[PDB]
């Protein structure tokens, strides 16, 4: 085990880390990288075709981070940018008027829930197919979004160094958004309010403390 890596300078890291994957600083005090985490009971497994446990963990981390990145904006946007102009002739009975994110879950018709579930299941199936076909050679991520070779409606082109820095930015924002989504959800649950109604009051004053006003006559 290597000693004194970047982050945890007074600890140690397993040798499986190495370099390779972007964003590797050496943070691994427990383990989880020295075990068969992608081969034991994998139903899709394929000897001489799968990747390395660390790449499987990177895929899981990327999935969680992408979901959290979407969730942070999902929490923030309706509070201060207003609700969707919907509920017009929809018969929702102010179903969109709620802003408390944990309250709108019990007022949205099941159509949207099942549409979202099905769409993400389709995307996951595409990811599974790509993972199965790219064998022990997965550029990781896959799902063929806007990079040349797959779908690219805007025709995004980048130099390899641009791709590397974009990957680093993506992973950093993913970790930060995981933390932020956790914090936002638990703050909303604990305070029973959204973020805007929780931060707005602590900006000017409480009413019981501010002075009455200015009542001195002028001109005397």
């Amino acid at each position: 085990w290597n000693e004194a890596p970047r982050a945890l300078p007074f600890g140690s890291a397993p040798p499986t880390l190495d370099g390779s994957l972007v964003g590797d600083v050496g943070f691994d005090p427990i383990g989880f990288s020295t075990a068969p985490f992608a081969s034991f009971n994998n139903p899709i497994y394929q000897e001489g075709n799968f990747m390395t446990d660390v790449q499987w963990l990177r895929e899981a981390e990327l999935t969680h981070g992408r979901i959290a990145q979407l969730a942070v904006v999902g929490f923030i946007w309706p509070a201060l940018f207003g609700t969707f102009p919907g509920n017009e002739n929809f018969g929702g009975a102010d179903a969109y008027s709620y802003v408390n994110p944990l309250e709108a879950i019990n007022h949205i018709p099941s159509l949207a829930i099942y549409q979202i579930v099905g769409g993400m299941a389709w995307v996951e199936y595409q990811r599974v197919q790509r993972i199965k076909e790219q064998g022990k050679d997965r550029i990781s991520g896959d799902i063929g979004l806007a990079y040349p070779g797959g779908w690219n409606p805007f025709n995004i082109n980048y130099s390899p160094e641009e791709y590397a820095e974009k990957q680093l930015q993506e992973i950093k924002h993913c970790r930060l958004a995981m933390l932020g989504a956790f914090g936002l959800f638990f703050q909303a649950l604990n305070s029973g309010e959204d973020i805007v109604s929780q931060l707005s009051p602590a900006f000017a004053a409480p009413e019981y403390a501010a002075k009455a006003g200015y009542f001195l006559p002028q001109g005397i």
Binding site: W1, G31, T34, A35, P36, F37, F40, N41
Partner: protein
């Protein structure tokens, strides 16, 4: 005589000589028993605090008996029917006897010194948790038998920010 689990706070702690001569097999069985009681105590200590703030809404006896209503502590064993206890004991026995719901990917591939230190720390944490569970049980039973005795109120005398 000298194996894992010997650290300097003290050093050997065998006053009454419960081992003395014994044998390798008996010592190994004793170590296994100590590790098992220790892990059970740690799980008990962790589980004695969680229900105070969180509660899963499942209806042990569909139609009624909903977790949300059963008491916490040593009073749950009276509320929970015998069928649930039998089912969960059979389930944990299936886990223990067979390899079901167990994965060998948790054995890890740690070096020797790291493994030894981690084992010693595991045993120390478990030894602490044993007495923790003892104190929890004694306080709960004393309070339930006679309310007001040991005037410290509420379950979990520490961590007062829960209430």
């Amino acid at each position: 005589e000298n194996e894992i689990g010997v650290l300097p706070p003290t050093g050997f702690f065998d006053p009454a000589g419960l081992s003395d001569g014994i044998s390798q097999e008996k010592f190994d069985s004793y170590r296994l028993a100590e590790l098992k009681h220790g892990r059970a105590a740690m799980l008990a200590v962790l589980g004695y605090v969680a229900p105070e703030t969180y509660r899963f809404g499942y209806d042990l006896i569909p139609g009624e008996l909903s977790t949300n209503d059963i008491p916490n502590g040593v009073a749950a064993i009276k509320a929970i029917p015998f069928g649930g206890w039998a089912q969960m004991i059979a389930f944990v026995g299936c886990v223990e006897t067979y390899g079901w719901f167990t994965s060998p990917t948790g054995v890890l591939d740690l070096p020797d010194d790291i493994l030894a230190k981690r084992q010693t720390a595991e045993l120390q944490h478990g030894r602490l948790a044993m007495l923790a569970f003892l104190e929890l049980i004694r306080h709960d039973s004393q309070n339930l038998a006679q309310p007001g005795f040991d005037g410290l109120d509420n379950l979990i005398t520490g961590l007062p920010f829960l209430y």
